[PDB]
């Protein structure tokens, strides 16, 4: 993922998201956002996040 | 979910039950029950439960 206008990854209302080595770049908001939902990322390359990377 | 004869939600023996604004009412037993299992209910509206609502 790259150049996201908003959160690079958003998981809302209990929706799990699987990820292993996903590269995140230039997101408008939090690169990874958990909203009562799980997110898995064994590795990552979160970069260029205007707000806090992991939320 | 209304007027259940037993626990209005049940995740047993594993498994997951997704829920966001789920409404329960009048359940005969536990409003939400879990046996080694995940249950997600962000904004549940448990009501009229005879036994303990969340278990």
UniProtKB/TrEMBL annotation, chains A, B:
Recorded superkingdom: Viruses
Name of the protein: Right handed beta helix domain-containing protein
Organism: Staphylococcus phage Andhra
């Amino acid at each position: 993922i790259e150049r996201a206008g908003r959160n690079g990854i958003e998981a809302t209302r209990g929706g799990q998201i699987f990820a292993d080595r996903i590269t995140i770049t230039g997101s408008g908001d939090f690169g990874i956002l958990a909203y009562a939902s799980k997110v898995f990322a064994e590795a990552s390359n979160i970069s260029g996040t205007k707000n806090e990377p992991v939320y």
